[PDB]
Amino acid sequence: MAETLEKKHERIMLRFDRAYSPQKEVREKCIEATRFARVPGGQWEGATAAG
């Protein structure tokens, strides 16, 4: 029944992990594309300090 509020919280945490696990590498590409398009120095990110 999950009477206590603490018992209801780890279920929410587990659901968050289950929702985050699959859609992890797609949002990475989305954020990378947005950063590559808008951030002024974002087109060289990953090799900023190289010499």
């Binding site: 002024p40 120095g41 087109q43 060289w44 090799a47 900023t48 300090a49």
Partner: protein
């Protein structure tokens, strides 16, 4: 190398003409000696050369241009 160079610079005291084999040995040893202590300088940027936007010269570095002179 030192011995062969000294022999070449000293043979004139006794008026002796060096043989080709001694010359080849001396030049080979001298080439090895100069090979050991060889340093090749590396050129550097001019100093007014721009630094691109990819280097993040806002927060990562303050250099809009290379120092390149030292």
């Amino acid at each position: 190398a030192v011995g062969y160079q000294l022999l070449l610079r000293m043979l004139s005291d006794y008026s002796l003409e060096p043989t080709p084999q001694v010359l080849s040995n001396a030049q080979r040893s001298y080439d090895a000696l100069m090979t050991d202590t060889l340093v090749v300088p590396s050129m550097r940027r001019r100093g007014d050369f721009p630094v691109g936007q990819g280097n993040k010269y806002d927060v990562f570095t303050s250099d809009r241009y290379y120092p390149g002179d030292l």
